[PDB]
């Protein structure tokens, strides 16, 4: 929206346009209160620049909250590269130039912003950024970074889901139906963990092959048009954000929402509807924090894989604290998590 | 539209919005090729944020060429603070917060951008910014800055003006009519320098007290509404930029255009029209470079006041070079100045 694009209250917006490639670059630093802003680089097509600015600010604000609630000593920021075509259609030379330009932008911020991988960006891309700028997390193990954080993200979402299911009074995942929307690196691992815990998995993915394989694995596919109308115990959004609009909130047929996607809730009204309908939502910025715990924990705090896994497991306890505030103060989980974030941040 | 203003080709755009004060902030770094970007902070009201961005971009690109052509080892940048209300209506607390936030933005750029005073900002404001960030030129002398660069700019414009009237075939300023639009810190000094050189001054300013003072000094007032229609030998825009639009360029009744205003020419066509009409224009980014020479020379290059003065006087020589390219190659002076900037940049 114009307001989210132009009247965003974050600390800083950085933009650049490269006529040659046709790409637009946006970096939004929401907060540097707890340390340098950090957040991944999302690369995607947007119908309008305002959309890219809007997304960047909402993602950057979620990162500030994620670091705060997760006890990580960093601020929140996010980069969005608005591509001139679908990522997959971008030629190598074009992609390379885009990364080079993005790295120059980050570099000018001189440590006030640290990037990482996100949608359509990977560790190889981090390595490429790193050929030009130091402020990059998520480089390959070979290049000095922590590599992939997907599994850690999946462990944390899985722990979140378990805590949420228990708090909702459903006991454990054994015997529950979990609908995973998105069979990516995180979604697929989450499906695996949940199935091992005894859940029956319903899966959806825009990639035919990904679905066919899950099915081959014993899971049941759900057609895209049926995702938001398929009954399940837990709805696990692991694909795009903004899934839960007011209308979706009103009609989702599940008891728990716990997934890996960022900015799951499209509006405040949606969150209140879920709450009113008895659908327990595990706040995205709390639930999917394993990625940030992995990268900041390992690269900034020097933690080993095992400690990072432990801390990701502790996302279940942070959620139990969130639900306790929610129940006590009578506010939605998202409000309670923001409250918890602020308390942990000593605000 | 934000959209089109976002289609700029410069190195970086920094923006911020402060709900509390309702101010918008823009820092545009056109280039960092020759050094960190540098340019003043202009504060004013804008109809739309897009205009502030557009303005910042044009001003930033002019700073790039200004440094290049003036042999200063810096890139070009510019800040624009889009005020929620008129400058004079802003309470001190609000102003103070606006400057604090601006300084925090500059600080994040960590030396890739250095600011200075410009429209509606002064040395005191520079000191204030400096309470938060190091990257500020133009601090008061007491705070370690070089103070006001207005007079140095005036000397440079005056030398530009002398070089231009001469090249135009009018002789010395003695006896010529010079119309100074804007009697501010620069314009007032230029009017005195010109008057001393024997010119007959016509002056205009929205500030009636300034006009009254000029009149007391023997100059002649021109009503604002008549500025662009007053015949003169030299038109010296020293107020706002964008005064010479295509339309004004066709009817301007003067032989020379030489002033202090940044971004004097509103459209490229206006540039072509003045050239075709035989009105010799001294490019803004060359002519008004005295302020930059003063700030960068004093604060970065370690030049004495005397050397700064000399460099500013040399703007006339720079112009002679510009006119020489324009004549030889058959291009407008603006184009010739850009060519010269590029050459100097490379040599340097
Ligand atoms: N990977 C991490 O460490 C991490 C950390 C935090 C948050 N997240 C979030 O988790 C989500 C997914 O992350 P990922 O790394 O696994 O991504 P991914 O690209 O590897 O996988 C996303 C998957 O979803 C599928 N998909 C896309 N749109 C879909 C739709 N409408 N319906 C169904 N499937 C669809 C894609 O084809 C793909 O298989 C994102 O929103 C991301 O921001 C990821
Ligand atoms: N001061 C420097 O060192 C410097 C250096 C380079 C470029 N410039 C440019 O030179 C111009 C003048 O700068 P300054 O420092 O003297 O500013 P200033 O604010 O001191 O003076 C501007 C003067 O113009 C008057 N004015 C405003 N609008 C007017 C209008 N529409 N018609 C007539 N008069 C009007 C103002 O009342 C004021 O007297 C600006 O465009 C500035 O960006 C200045
Ligand atoms: O939240 C995340 O998982 C992504 O923004 C990746 C990232 C995390 C932490 C720091 C930088 C980048
Ligand atoms: O051109 C000018 O005079 C102003 O932008 C002031 C300035 C010059 C150089 C560096 C910073 C600021
Ligand atoms: K740009
Ligand atoms: K990725
Ligand atoms: K169960
Ligand atoms: K000033
Ligand atoms: Na001021």
mmCIF file of C-alpha atoms in Angstrom, chain A residues 125-323:
data_model
loop_
_atom_site.group_PDB
_atom_site.id
_atom_site.type_symbol
_atom_site.label_atom_id
_atom_site.label_comp_id
_atom_site.label_asym_id
_atom_site.label_seq_id
_atom_site.Cartn_x
_atom_site.Cartn_y
_atom_site.Cartn_z
ATOM 1 C CA UNK A 125 24.447 -16.404 -3.952
ATOM 2 C CA UNK A 126 25.791 -15.429 -0.505
ATOM 3 C CA UNK A 127 29.224 -16.484 -1.592
ATOM 4 C CA UNK A 128 28.889 -14.330 -4.693
ATOM 5 C CA UNK A 129 27.754 -11.337 -2.557
ATOM 6 C CA UNK A 130 30.686 -12.046 -0.352
ATOM 7 C CA UNK A 131 33.076 -11.639 -3.241
ATOM 8 C CA UNK A 132 32.191 -7.962 -2.964
ATOM 9 C CA UNK A 133 30.969 -7.295 0.589
ATOM 10 C CA UNK A 134 31.783 -8.632 4.031
ATOM 11 C CA UNK A 135 28.249 -8.253 5.508
ATOM 12 C CA UNK A 136 26.806 -11.627 4.620
ATOM 13 C CA UNK A 137 25.601 -14.520 6.638
ATOM 14 C CA UNK A 138 24.792 -17.901 5.136
ATOM 15 C CA UNK A 139 27.859 -18.336 2.956
ATOM 16 C CA UNK A 140 28.667 -21.979 2.147
ATOM 17 C CA UNK A 141 30.622 -23.899 4.817
ATOM 18 C CA UNK A 142 33.473 -23.835 2.261
ATOM 19 C CA UNK A 143 33.396 -20.009 2.223
ATOM 20 C CA UNK A 144 33.274 -19.556 5.956
ATOM 21 C CA UNK A 145 29.598 -19.372 6.710
ATOM 22 C CA UNK A 146 27.164 -21.670 8.394
ATOM 23 C CA UNK A 147 25.621 -22.850 5.171
ATOM 24 C CA UNK A 148 22.031 -23.936 5.041
ATOM 25 C CA UNK A 149 19.754 -23.039 7.825
ATOM 26 C CA UNK A 150 16.712 -24.892 6.458
ATOM 27 C CA UNK A 151 16.874 -27.905 8.745
ATOM 28 C CA UNK A 152 17.270 -25.707 11.848
ATOM 29 C CA UNK A 153 14.253 -23.667 10.654
ATOM 30 C CA UNK A 154 12.275 -26.945 10.225
ATOM 31 C CA UNK A 155 13.301 -28.130 13.755
ATOM 32 C CA UNK A 156 12.108 -24.901 15.248
ATOM 33 C CA UNK A 157 8.810 -24.896 13.366
ATOM 34 C CA UNK A 158 8.320 -28.548 14.339
ATOM 35 C CA UNK A 159 8.943 -27.676 18.067
ATOM 36 C CA UNK A 160 6.598 -24.702 17.618
ATOM 37 C CA UNK A 161 3.968 -26.952 16.155
ATOM 38 C CA UNK A 162 4.334 -29.449 19.034
ATOM 39 C CA UNK A 163 4.029 -26.749 21.640
ATOM 40 C CA UNK A 164 1.040 -25.237 19.882
ATOM 41 C CA UNK A 165 -0.743 -28.570 19.474
ATOM 42 C CA UNK A 166 -0.208 -29.296 23.176
ATOM 43 C CA UNK A 167 -1.406 -25.868 24.260
ATOM 44 C CA UNK A 168 -4.455 -26.173 22.060
ATOM 45 C CA UNK A 169 -5.320 -29.379 24.022
ATOM 46 C CA UNK A 170 -4.740 -31.839 21.209
ATOM 47 C CA UNK A 171 -1.996 -33.717 22.976
ATOM 48 C CA UNK A 172 0.723 -34.671 20.558
ATOM 49 C CA UNK A 173 1.153 -34.827 16.772
ATOM 50 C CA UNK A 174 0.496 -38.561 16.819
ATOM 51 C CA UNK A 175 -2.732 -39.073 15.015
ATOM 52 C CA UNK A 176 -3.191 -35.515 13.850
ATOM 53 C CA UNK A 177 -3.584 -34.424 10.217
ATOM 54 C CA UNK A 178 -1.034 -31.762 9.264
ATOM 55 C CA UNK A 179 -1.372 -29.839 5.966
ATOM 56 C CA UNK A 180 2.012 -28.583 4.801
ATOM 57 C CA UNK A 181 1.716 -25.860 2.116
ATOM 58 C CA UNK A 182 5.124 -25.717 0.432
ATOM 59 C CA UNK A 183 7.514 -28.674 0.059
ATOM 60 C CA UNK A 184 10.699 -26.704 -0.085
ATOM 61 C CA UNK A 185 13.786 -27.217 1.934
ATOM 62 C CA UNK A 186 11.972 -26.310 5.147
ATOM 63 C CA UNK A 187 8.497 -27.630 4.334
ATOM 64 C CA UNK A 188 9.738 -31.008 3.230
ATOM 65 C CA UNK A 189 11.813 -31.500 6.381
ATOM 66 C CA UNK A 190 8.956 -30.326 8.538
ATOM 67 C CA UNK A 191 6.689 -32.881 6.834
ATOM 68 C CA UNK A 192 9.215 -35.566 7.552
ATOM 69 C CA UNK A 193 9.545 -34.639 11.228
ATOM 70 C CA UNK A 194 5.762 -34.488 11.679
ATOM 71 C CA UNK A 195 5.188 -37.780 9.952
ATOM 72 C CA UNK A 196 7.808 -39.428 12.151
ATOM 73 C CA UNK A 197 5.942 -37.995 15.183
ATOM 74 C CA UNK A 198 2.888 -39.885 13.936
ATOM 75 C CA UNK A 199 1.012 -37.242 11.982
ATOM 76 C CA UNK A 200 -0.789 -37.970 8.659
ATOM 77 C CA UNK A 201 0.477 -35.453 6.127
ATOM 78 C CA UNK A 202 -1.483 -33.575 3.490
ATOM 79 C CA UNK A 203 0.863 -31.761 1.155
ATOM 80 C CA UNK A 204 0.737 -29.068 -1.528
ATOM 81 C CA UNK A 205 3.362 -27.511 -3.694
ATOM 82 C CA UNK A 206 3.258 -25.692 -7.080
ATOM 83 C CA UNK A 207 5.981 -28.047 -8.269
ATOM 84 C CA UNK A 208 4.392 -31.295 -9.574
ATOM 85 C CA UNK A 209 7.465 -33.335 -8.961
ATOM 86 C CA UNK A 210 7.733 -32.234 -5.340
ATOM 87 C CA UNK A 211 4.147 -33.375 -4.777
ATOM 88 C CA UNK A 212 4.590 -36.637 -6.651
ATOM 89 C CA UNK A 213 7.525 -37.476 -4.484
ATOM 90 C CA UNK A 214 5.790 -36.759 -1.176
ATOM 91 C CA UNK A 215 3.035 -38.958 -2.298
ATOM 92 C CA UNK A 216 5.586 -41.574 -3.180
ATOM 93 C CA UNK A 217 6.706 -41.166 0.386
ATOM 94 C CA UNK A 218 3.222 -42.077 1.577
ATOM 95 C CA UNK A 219 1.809 -38.547 1.900
ATOM 96 C CA UNK A 220 -1.409 -37.326 0.347
ATOM 97 C CA UNK A 221 -1.473 -34.414 -2.111
ATOM 98 C CA UNK A 222 -3.879 -31.493 -1.935
ATOM 99 C CA UNK A 223 -4.616 -29.496 -5.066
ATOM 100 C CA UNK A 224 -3.642 -25.792 -4.899
ATOM 101 C CA UNK A 225 -7.202 -24.752 -5.234
ATOM 102 C CA UNK A 226 -8.092 -26.841 -2.256
ATOM 103 C CA UNK A 227 -5.423 -25.826 0.208
ATOM 104 C CA UNK A 228 -7.297 -23.301 2.210
ATOM 105 C CA UNK A 229 -10.511 -25.368 2.338
ATOM 106 C CA UNK A 230 -9.099 -28.767 3.291
ATOM 107 C CA UNK A 231 -9.806 -29.877 6.880
ATOM 108 C CA UNK A 232 -6.821 -30.572 8.915
ATOM 109 C CA UNK A 233 -5.694 -30.348 12.599
ATOM 110 C CA UNK A 234 -2.710 -28.203 11.840
ATOM 111 C CA UNK A 235 -2.229 -25.855 8.803
ATOM 112 C CA UNK A 236 1.448 -25.367 8.187
ATOM 113 C CA UNK A 237 2.108 -22.502 5.792
ATOM 114 C CA UNK A 238 5.578 -23.063 4.383
ATOM 115 C CA UNK A 239 5.325 -21.194 1.088
ATOM 116 C CA UNK A 240 4.438 -17.538 0.559
ATOM 117 C CA UNK A 241 3.453 -14.956 3.104
ATOM 118 C CA UNK A 242 0.128 -13.100 3.304
ATOM 119 C CA UNK A 243 -1.760 -16.375 3.144
ATOM 120 C CA UNK A 244 -4.108 -15.641 5.951
ATOM 121 C CA UNK A 245 -6.350 -12.798 4.832
ATOM 122 C CA UNK A 246 -9.538 -11.963 6.727
ATOM 123 C CA UNK A 247 -11.445 -14.228 4.435
ATOM 124 C CA UNK A 248 -9.080 -17.086 4.778
ATOM 125 C CA UNK A 249 -9.177 -16.581 8.598
ATOM 126 C CA UNK A 250 -12.907 -16.931 8.511
ATOM 127 C CA UNK A 251 -12.898 -20.142 6.585
ATOM 128 C CA UNK A 252 -9.720 -22.145 7.444
ATOM 129 C CA UNK A 253 -10.876 -25.518 8.808
ATOM 130 C CA UNK A 254 -8.110 -26.400 11.315
ATOM 131 C CA UNK A 255 -7.337 -25.874 15.032
ATOM 132 C CA UNK A 256 -3.733 -24.758 14.844
ATOM 133 C CA UNK A 257 -1.675 -22.618 12.398
ATOM 134 C CA UNK A 258 2.084 -23.181 12.754
ATOM 135 C CA UNK A 259 4.347 -22.932 9.707
ATOM 136 C CA UNK A 260 7.580 -21.513 8.384
ATOM 137 C CA UNK A 261 6.313 -18.741 6.180
ATOM 138 C CA UNK A 262 7.129 -15.127 6.950
ATOM 139 C CA UNK A 263 4.291 -12.605 7.426
ATOM 140 C CA UNK A 264 1.594 -15.248 7.352
ATOM 141 C CA UNK A 265 -1.153 -12.992 8.629
ATOM 142 C CA UNK A 266 -2.269 -10.478 6.014
ATOM 143 C CA UNK A 267 -4.036 -8.019 8.338
ATOM 144 C CA UNK A 268 -4.687 -7.549 12.149
ATOM 145 C CA UNK A 269 -8.302 -8.334 11.617
ATOM 146 C CA UNK A 270 -7.199 -11.875 10.471
ATOM 147 C CA UNK A 271 -5.335 -12.564 13.604
ATOM 148 C CA UNK A 272 -8.354 -11.601 15.748
ATOM 149 C CA UNK A 273 -10.608 -13.854 13.695
ATOM 150 C CA UNK A 274 -8.321 -16.887 14.155
ATOM 151 C CA UNK A 275 -8.219 -16.124 17.849
ATOM 152 C CA UNK A 276 -11.995 -15.829 18.007
ATOM 153 C CA UNK A 277 -12.526 -19.043 16.059
ATOM 154 C CA UNK A 278 -10.377 -21.042 18.413
ATOM 155 C CA UNK A 279 -7.603 -21.563 15.900
ATOM 156 C CA UNK A 280 -4.321 -21.306 17.783
ATOM 157 C CA UNK A 281 -1.712 -19.495 15.797
ATOM 158 C CA UNK A 282 2.007 -19.746 16.536
ATOM 159 C CA UNK A 283 3.414 -16.336 15.572
ATOM 160 C CA UNK A 284 5.534 -16.618 12.476
ATOM 161 C CA UNK A 285 8.387 -14.487 13.771
ATOM 162 C CA UNK A 286 8.634 -16.752 16.821
ATOM 163 C CA UNK A 287 8.042 -20.083 15.041
ATOM 164 C CA UNK A 288 10.342 -19.752 12.096
ATOM 165 C CA UNK A 289 13.215 -18.245 14.005
ATOM 166 C CA UNK A 290 15.420 -21.338 13.723
ATOM 167 C CA UNK A 291 16.923 -19.871 10.554
ATOM 168 C CA UNK A 292 18.047 -16.738 12.362
ATOM 169 C CA UNK A 293 19.125 -18.737 15.397
ATOM 170 C CA UNK A 294 21.293 -20.856 13.084
ATOM 171 C CA UNK A 295 22.943 -17.992 11.184
ATOM 172 C CA UNK A 296 23.312 -15.485 14.088
ATOM 173 C CA UNK A 297 24.034 -18.217 16.624
ATOM 174 C CA UNK A 298 26.746 -19.838 14.557
ATOM 175 C CA UNK A 299 28.205 -16.839 12.771
ATOM 176 C CA UNK A 300 27.905 -14.206 15.329
ATOM 177 C CA UNK A 301 27.897 -16.113 18.651
ATOM 178 C CA UNK A 302 30.089 -19.002 17.638
ATOM 179 C CA UNK A 303 27.588 -21.619 18.636
ATOM 180 C CA UNK A 304 27.982 -25.246 17.394
ATOM 181 C CA UNK A 305 25.339 -27.015 15.306
ATOM 182 C CA UNK A 306 24.194 -28.800 18.400
ATOM 183 C CA UNK A 307 23.646 -25.688 20.409
ATOM 184 C CA UNK A 308 21.819 -24.058 17.607
ATOM 185 C CA UNK A 309 19.597 -27.101 17.381
ATOM 186 C CA UNK A 310 18.945 -26.853 21.094
ATOM 187 C CA UNK A 311 18.051 -23.177 20.894
ATOM 188 C CA UNK A 312 15.760 -23.893 17.960
ATOM 189 C CA UNK A 313 14.102 -26.526 20.116
ATOM 190 C CA UNK A 314 13.595 -23.834 22.776
ATOM 191 C CA UNK A 315 11.259 -22.034 20.370
ATOM 192 C CA UNK A 316 8.568 -24.354 21.896
ATOM 193 C CA UNK A 317 9.251 -22.819 25.355
ATOM 194 C CA UNK A 318 9.178 -19.240 23.941
ATOM 195 C CA UNK A 319 5.794 -20.078 22.410
ATOM 196 C CA UNK A 320 4.572 -21.521 25.731
ATOM 197 C CA UNK A 321 5.483 -18.068 27.217
ATOM 198 C CA UNK A 322 3.637 -16.369 24.395
ATOM 199 C CA UNK A 323 0.522 -18.434 24.953
#
